[PDB]
Design a protein around this ligand. Structure first.
Ligand SMILES: [Cl-]
Lengths: 128, 129
């Protein structure tokens, strides 16, 4: 409401969006009942396919404090190449600012083969 | 952290700490100390009302329970070609190193002295100085 509160809301949204990215990273990496996650299994199949699905994998999460992150993962091959070493996966995590439809969006891209970060960005965005 | 999985976690943690640093700096700017404006507020209030204000950075740090550190720098400047407090914008820079590295996450938020409205915001992973 106030500009003072708007600042705090922007910061909380940045924090929640980042928490969503961490949640996604864990969902990707952490085994479930001793075997890869369904999300990892999907990207493993895509990474080893010469014409992979590019359908986003979408989820939403409510944290303990009631803040919400809307999360999407997707991948694409470097243009003109195939193979897992040329497959890069992007996590997008969005969280709306309280009392607003503006949102903070965190976008991190990592390589399937190395798990190294290729790019990272984060921005306050106006409402869709 | 040297594995790439840990590096990603360390990047996220440095982003958390930098963001929390900005939040604490905001509170330090705004919150009264003994019924009187904070010392950092009084300094920018003086600057905002000067035709040639000091552009000296004001430095602080915040150490968190997990042991991470945010280094804070605040400063201000008048909009080029303009004067007065309505045209005085203050920038908070908040840095935190990634664990096991001198690479860092830097959060930079600029707000207007008069309105307290956000004028710009950015954040980046940075290579070591
Ligand atoms: Cl790894």
């Amino acid at each position: 409401q106030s500009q003072t509160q708007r600042m705090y809301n922007y910061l909380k949204a940045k924090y929640t969006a980042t928490s969503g990215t961490q949640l996604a990273w864990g969902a990707y990496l952490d085994p479930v009942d001793g075997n890869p996650s369904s999300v990892y299994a999907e990207f493993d199949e895509r990474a080893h396919n010469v014409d992979p699905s590019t359908e986003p994998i979408k989820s939403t999460h409510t944290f303990k404090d009631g803040s919400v992150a809307e999360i999407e993962m997707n991948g694409q091959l470097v243009d003109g190449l195939t193979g897992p070493e040329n497959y890069n996966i992007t996590i997008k995590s969005k969280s709306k600012l309280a009392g607003s439809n503006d949102y903070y969006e965190h976008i991190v891209t990592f390589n399937f083969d190395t798990k190294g970060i290729r790019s990272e960005e984060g921005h306050l965005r106006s409402a869709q």
